[PDB]
């Protein structure tokens, strides 16, 4: 009766080893499905979180090591530069011998770092301008400080690019940290102690007199400046609706509305925008359209930067860039970083050098490392099987529209328009394997020296930023993938109306051609539904079938969506996370991902029921009293098995737009009538409550 094939057994073993059958599925399904995993596994010293995703990403890093470390004579140019970059990164001897020499060479190009400079006012401060200072970091190194000017896809014309103006990403994980009291006092102290440590080492390098009280004063001033900038930034709750965010206006208007006075000299946006864009030979006039995402920030910024000199501002601007570079320097500089990462993430040790490097080259040469990965790990024939499952779930999503009692039939037709217009990107672009020319031409502008890691990373910062600003006048590439192939994740692009499933997630426990379809639908099936559902989530649902920010919702169907989805906002809002000192989840920040989980699992289950009706049942797995209907739900839960450090649990609640592992399982299965039926759970039990939140 039951299956007895190697791939059936591997499934059973993993399923049994992970689950704890001495717990009631109706009392706590997380502790039921993962209890076995929790008992055996402990968070590694280098990790802040650990689970199925983080184990697979660590298993993916091993595969990247194997290919990058060993050269081959048959390898093309694009590959050689990837492997050369890896060898340059892992050579500790070569890096350590330089010390902070590469940084001292670079500081002059970014108008120096005043705290670790002598007579700065005369050297730079004299002929210093807010435009050229912020523009250098932005244009040369891709570092956005005070003003975050970048070039991206236009929300109302998804084929066109346009200059965006937004608030900058802060030094600490979220604006919430800059209170610096209670749970944040630890991090804020370490952050300023990290500033001083790096400042001290640079002065020792330059042979200047170390005055401890002068370092402490100047760097607490940098903390004071960033506290004001942090307070001026809008909360994630006020950036949820993209219609209220998108505010297109010309540079002419921006100068009239959002004028600034930095170090006496009034700020010129025309001079500033050109200083950046002139790097790639493109002229900007006052009649240039600019999507301002943070108008309230710029308004609040005016009175902040009027009471701070060029010194105080360049101390922050230079520090914010140095902070990133520290990990590309000697062990002496990396020591000060690891101290700060203990307070923030809870990690007692530094990530293995070969793991940091494998990921760095994978991030700066996606297609090159993607080729090496899919050549080794990924099959290729599996791409056919996934394409079918996506088509099945896409149809199952449309089938559900007719059943929905809160959408008028005109909005249902417009929802089917987007649903059928969703493009699917599976595994990898076939270009990187077959077409060698295109791949070599991508990294042609890059020349790496094996004994010059810091010059290599600074080169990659130019190549990246240059590649982006180039696109301002270009029609967006429809063929260009958003993610590389060597990634354990899955994405949706609102701008392209595109679902993406890299080769990294097309593996157990999510998908395998051999393993039971129950597990496939429970794993990848839910993920496919999730990223489809992102097309119609709180942000997702404001974008048409061409990925344009246009309203296609009736004032009743829209009003209903809010009313219906407000359920999940309250549900997840009423979850106290023990690992984060019993703080409640931000139900508004997590809504988008929560909607996608609840929608995806439901869509995935129906797609499996359509498979049951069409293909009948399949041989059960050994050593398990669970039937095929349950193994679907068990596999879904085992996807999210894992635990967090308290230091990063705090970090997670404020930043992460995802709910933590345990509540993604509980939250959705509480809202699943099919789960309660499959596991025969009584009404009023914790995993089967009366009120059930539903959207898709």
């Amino acid at each position: 009766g039951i299956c007895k094939s190697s791939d059936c057994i591997k499934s059973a073993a993993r399923l049994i080893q992970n689950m704890d059958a001495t717990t009631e599925p109706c009392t706590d399904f997380f502790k039921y499905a993962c209890g076995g995993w929790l008992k055996r596994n402990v968070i590694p010293e280098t990790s802040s979180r650990y689970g199925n995703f983080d184990i697979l990403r660590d298993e993916l890093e091993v595969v990247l090591k194997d290919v990058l470390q060993e050269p081959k004579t048959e390898d093309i140019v694009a590959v050689q530069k990837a492997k050369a970059l890896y060898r340059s990164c892992i050579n500790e001897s070569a890096i350590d011998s330089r010390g902070g020499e590469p940084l001292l060479k670079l500081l002059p190009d970014i108008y120096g770092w005043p705290v670790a400079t002598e007579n700065w006012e005369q050297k730079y401060g004299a002929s210093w301008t807010a435009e050229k200072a912020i523009a250098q970091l932005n244009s040369k190194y891709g570092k956005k400080v005070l003003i975050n000017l970048f070039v991206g896809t236009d929300d109302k014309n998804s084929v066109n690019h346009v200059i965006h103006i937004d608030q900058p990403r802060l030094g600490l994980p979220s604006r919430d940290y800059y209170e610096c009291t209670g749970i944040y006092k630890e991090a804020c102290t370490a952050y300023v102690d990290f500033m001083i440590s790096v400042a001290r080492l640079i002065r020792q390098e330059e042979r200047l007199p170390i005055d401890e009280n002068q370092l402490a004063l100047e760097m607490n001033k940098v903390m004071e400046l960033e506290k004001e900038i942090a307070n001026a930034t809008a909360k994630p709750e006020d950036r949820n609706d993209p219609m209220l965010l998108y505010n297109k206006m010309t540079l002419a208007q921006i100068q009239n509305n959002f004028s600034l006075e930095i170090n006496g000299k009034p700020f010129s946006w025309l001079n500033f925008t050109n200083e950046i864009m002139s790097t790639v030979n493109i002229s900007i006039t006052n009649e240039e359209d600019v999507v301002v995402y943070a108008p309230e920030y710029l308004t609040k910024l005016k009175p902040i930067l009027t009471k701070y000199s060029a010194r105080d501002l360049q101390n922050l601007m230079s520090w914010r860039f140095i902070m990133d570079l520290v990990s590309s320097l000697s062990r002496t500089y990396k020591e000060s970083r690891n101290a700060f990462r203990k307070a923030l993430y809870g990690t007692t040790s530094e990530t293995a050098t070969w793991r940091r490097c494998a990921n760095y080259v994978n991030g700066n040469m996606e297609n090159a490392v993607g080729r090496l990965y899919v050549e080794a790990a990924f099959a290729g024939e599996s791409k056919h099987v996934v394409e079918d499952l996506i088509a099945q779930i896409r149809e199952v999503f449309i089938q559900t529209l007719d059943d929905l009692t809160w959408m008028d039939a005109e909005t249902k037709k417009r929802a089917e328009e987007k649903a059928l217009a969703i493009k699917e990107r599976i595994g990898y672009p076939d270009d990187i394997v077959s077409n060698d020319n295109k791949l070599n031409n991508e990294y042609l502008e890059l020349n790496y020296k094996e004994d010059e890691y810091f010059e290599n990373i600074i080169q990659n910062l130019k190549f990246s930023q240059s590649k982006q600003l180039k696109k301002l006048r270009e029609k967006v590439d429809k063929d260009e993938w958003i993610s590389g192939a060597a990634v354990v994740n899955a994405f949706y692009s609102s701008g392209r109306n595109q679902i993406v499933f890299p080769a990294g997630i097309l593996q157990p426990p999510f998908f395998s051609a051999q393993q039971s379809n129950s597990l496939n639908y429970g794993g990848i099936g839910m993920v496919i539904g999730h990223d489809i559902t992102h097309g119609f989530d709180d942000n997702g649902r404001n974008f048409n079938k061409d990925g344009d920010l246009v309203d296609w919702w009736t004032q009743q169907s829209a009003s209903n969506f809010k009313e219906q989805s407000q359920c999940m906002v309250y549900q997840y809002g009423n979850f106290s996370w023990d690992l984060a000192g019993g703080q409640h989840l931000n139900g508004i920040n997590t809504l988008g991902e929560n909607i996608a989980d609840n929608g995806g699992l439901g869509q995935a289950y129906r797609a499996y029921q359509n498979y049951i009706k069409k293909n009948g049942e399949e041989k059960l797995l050994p050593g398990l009293d669970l039937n095929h209907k349950q193994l679907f739900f068990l596999n879904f839960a085992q996807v999210w098995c894992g635990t967090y450090r308290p230091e990063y649990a705090v970090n997670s609640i404020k930043t992460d737009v995802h709910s933590p592992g345990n509540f993604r399982i509980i939250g959705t299965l509480q809202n699943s009538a099919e789960f309660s039926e499959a596991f025969h759970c009584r009404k009023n039990s914790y995993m089967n409550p009366e009120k059930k939140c539903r959207v898709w």
């Binding site: 995703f53 994740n489 899955a490 997630i505 993920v527 999730h530 737009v657 995802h658």
Partner: peptide, 4 residues
């Protein structure tokens, strides 16, 4: 995104 599914995870971070």
């Amino acid at each position: 995104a599914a995870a971070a």
